[PDB]
Amino acid sequence: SQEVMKNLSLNFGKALDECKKEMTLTDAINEDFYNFWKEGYEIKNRETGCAIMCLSTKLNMLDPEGNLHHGNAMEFAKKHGADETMAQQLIDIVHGCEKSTPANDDKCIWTLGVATCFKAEIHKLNWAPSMDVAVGE
Amino acid sequence: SQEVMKNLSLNFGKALDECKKEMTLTDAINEDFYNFWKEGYEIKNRETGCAIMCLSTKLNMLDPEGNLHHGNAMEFAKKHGADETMAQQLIDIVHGCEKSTPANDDKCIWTLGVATCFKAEIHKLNWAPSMDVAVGE
Numbered sequence: 317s318q319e320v321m322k323n324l325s326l327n328f329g330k331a332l333d334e335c336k337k338e339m340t341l342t343d344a345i346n347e348d349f350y351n352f353w354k355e356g357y358e359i360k361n362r363e364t365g366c367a368i369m370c371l372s373t374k375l376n377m378l379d380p381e382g383n384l385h386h387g388n389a390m391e392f393a394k395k396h397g398a399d400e401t402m403a404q405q406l407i408d409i410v411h412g413c414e415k416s417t418p419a420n421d422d423k424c425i426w427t428l429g430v431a432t433c434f435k436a437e438i439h440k441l442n443w444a445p446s447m448d449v450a451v452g453e
Numbered sequence: 454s455q456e457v458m459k460n461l462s463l464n465f466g467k468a469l470d471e472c473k474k475e476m477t478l479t480d481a482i483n484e485d486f487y488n489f490w491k492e493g494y495e496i497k498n499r500e501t502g503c504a505i506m507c508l509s510t511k512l513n514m515l516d517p518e519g520n521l522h523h524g525n526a527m528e529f530a531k532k533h534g535a536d537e538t539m540a541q542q543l544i545d546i547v548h549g550c551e552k553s554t555p556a557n558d559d560k561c562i563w564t565l566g567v568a569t570c571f572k573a574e575i576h577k578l579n580w581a582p583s584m585d586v587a588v589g590e
């Protein structure tokens with residue numbers, strides 16, 4: 317649901333300021349987060365991949381290979397309002413996008429690739445929200 | 454708590470190198486200690502069963518019948534940050550896993566079975582650490 321996706325999106329972005337400082341990321345990521353759920357907007361900055369990776373790492377959502385930790389993603393999803401089925405469906409998109417995008421040793425570009433694939437799949441479910449406030453803000 | 458399980462996992466395995474040097478053991482067990490908590494991973498080596506016994510025995514967590522000593526297991530769990538409810542929950546998993554695992558006269562193998570049952574239940578509670586997955590150092 318769009319509603320849940322808004323709540324997940326705002327809770328996922330809350331540490332962005334903390335990641336921006338800590339990783340010295342430029343303001344190039346600002347347009348990607350402001351536009352994250354705008355259908356047809358292409359996210360293409362490498363640093364946004366870095367930012368997303370930092371955000372996941374901070375929510376304990378990553379394993380030591382860099383793939384999603386299913387336990388903590390499920391717990392995150394549930395904490396912000398998804399039921400079991402919606403939570404599993406989101407895990408399955410992320411997991412599907414990890415297997416469907418080309419392996420890349422540059423973790424920031426690979427995380428970007430996962431995130432773009434995830435965004436597209438959420439648009440296809442008609443779950444992308446209309447945000448009044450940007451992710452990260 | 455995953456933070457607590459991290460603290461107990463680091464500290465339970467601190468004497469592994471001492472364990473390895475004293476006994477028998479191939480470096481084949483390192484794969485099980487380094488990857489213990491990963492969601493896909495199954496602990497697999499027989500000497501890891503033997504390592505866990507030496508670590509338990511050295512921490513004074515094993516009774517005369519070979520079973521967990523609940524009093525000292527409580528002390529170890531609390532020392533490393535478990536409150537009483539989580540401590541008791543860990544004891545009850547161990548104790549349940551001592552019952553549900555098939556009897557065996559190889560103690561190394563039986564301990565491997567109790568440890569794999571313990572791991573599975575910590576995954577079910579979402580208490581396995583997501584990025585810091587090792588037992589020991």
Ligand SMILES: CCC/C=C\C=C\CCCCCCCCCO
Nearest residue numbers: 324325328368369372389406431
């Ligand atoms: C698992 C639930 C995700 C929820 C909300 C996401 C909002 C925008 C961020 C999407 C990126 C998720 C993919 C990340 C895995 C690798 O960091």
Ligand SMILES: CCC/C=C\C=C\CCCCCCCCCO
Nearest residue numbers: 461462465509514526543568571
């Ligand atoms: C009850 C406390 C155990 C704490 C931490 C364990 C980390 C690795 C898990 C190994 C399985 C435990 C097996 C029982 C042996 C007694 O310590």
